[PDB]
């Protein structure tokens, strides 16, 4: 409910979002989610439901112009040793970031995590979230439509996902969502 | 009356639900803020802002 109340901020001349030019409304929300996340670090919930809700709310505040658009927090919560709900919430935030900020290195981070993660459910979920919220569609001109990305995703369909039967269908779905049924257009 | 009259007297009791809710709420908020600042200062810490 605190995350639902966040309206987009009135940035002037692309002003850098710092602590002093914060909204007086959003400072209370940010204090509350900081208190909740830190108290979850000491007294945890049943399935880290407050971690998932606070990561989702920090992504809501980053989607508007309130918190700086930095994926390092979600990249630290998406490591292997965390609970799987925290991991998929953080990876959902990283997928949303690499859709909005057109990040090349975050997409390479996600594709590397698809290739070598210990939990195969997390790999399937990353391919699923990158299909649902794709970094670009076939209609879009994006900076991320190289021949290098077409070769990486074709290598991920062909080899690489050969051991799961669910990662390979997810890679086929991702290639269909990104490049369509015909020849990838952004290619010689 | 002062020559021989004595009545005990007590302190003013605060039986008000509003101020009791306010006292318990503010004391709980202050002790949890003090606890979390003490535990963040004497351990590894993160920060939403640069060097915060």
Interrupted backbone of chain A, residues before each interruption (C–N > 2.5 Å): none
Q: What is the distance of C-alpha A8 from the center of its chain?
A: 20
User: Looking at residue A78, what DSSP letter applies?
Assistant: T
Chain B hits for A34, CB-CB cut-off 8 Å, are 48
Neighbouring residues of A93: CB distance < 8 A, sequence distance ≥ 6? A55, A56, A58, A59, A71, A74
Query: Are A135 and A102 a contacting pair, CB within 8 Å?
Result: yes
Shortest CB distance from A39 goes to which of B36, B48, B49? B36
Q: Is A19 touching B (CB cutoff 8 A)?
A: yes
A42/B39 Cβ within 8 A = yes
Chain A hits for B25, CB-CB cut-off 8 Å, are none
Query: Are A40 and A48 a contacting pair, CB within 8 Å?
Result: yes
Taking CA atoms, A180 is separated from A43, A99, A138, A174, in Å, by 47, 18, 6, 9
B48/A38 Cβ within 8 A = no
CA A172 to CA A32: how far, in whole Å?
42
CA A65 to CA A184: how far, in whole Å?
34
Query: Are A99 and A133 a contacting pair, CB within 8 Å?
Result: yes
Query: Are A51 and A37 a contacting pair, CB within 8 Å?
Result: yes
First vs last C-alpha separation in chain B: 67
> Smallest CA–CA separation between B35 and chain A, in Å?
10
Neighbours of A75 (CB within 10 A): 17
- Experimental method used, please? cryo-EM
């Amino acid at each position: 409910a605190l995350a639902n109340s966040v309206t987009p901020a009135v940035s002037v001349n692309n002003e850098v979002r710092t602590l002093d030019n914060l909204n007086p409304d959003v400072r209370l929300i940010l204090e509350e989610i900081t208190r909740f996340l830190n108290m979850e670090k000491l007294l945890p919930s049943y399935r880290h439901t407050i971690t998932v809700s606070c990561l989702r709310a920090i992504r809501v505040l980053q989607k508007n112009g309130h918190v700086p658009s930095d994926p390092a927090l979600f990249k630290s919560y998406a490591e292997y040793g965390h609970f799987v709900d925290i991991r998929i919430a953080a990876l959902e935030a990283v997928v949303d970031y690499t859709k909005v900020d057109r990040s090349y290195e975050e997409l390479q981070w996600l594709l590397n995590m698809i290739q070598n993660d210990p939990v195969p459910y997390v790999r399937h979920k990353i391919l699923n979230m990158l299909t649902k919220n794709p970094p670009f569609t076939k209609n879009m001109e994006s900076p991320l439509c190289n021949e290098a990305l077409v070769d990486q995703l074709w290598k991920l369909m062909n080899s690489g996902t050969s051991h799961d039967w669910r990662l390979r269908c997810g890679a086929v779905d991702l290639y269909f969502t990104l490049f369509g049924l015909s020849r990838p257009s952004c290619l010689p | 009356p002062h020559t021989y009259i004595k009545t005990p007297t007590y302190r003013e009791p605060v039986s008000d639900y509003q101020v009791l809710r306010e006292k318990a709420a503010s004391q709980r908020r202050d002790v949890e803020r003090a606890l979390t600042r003490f535990m963040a200062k004497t351990g590894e810490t993160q920060s939403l802002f640069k060097d915060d």
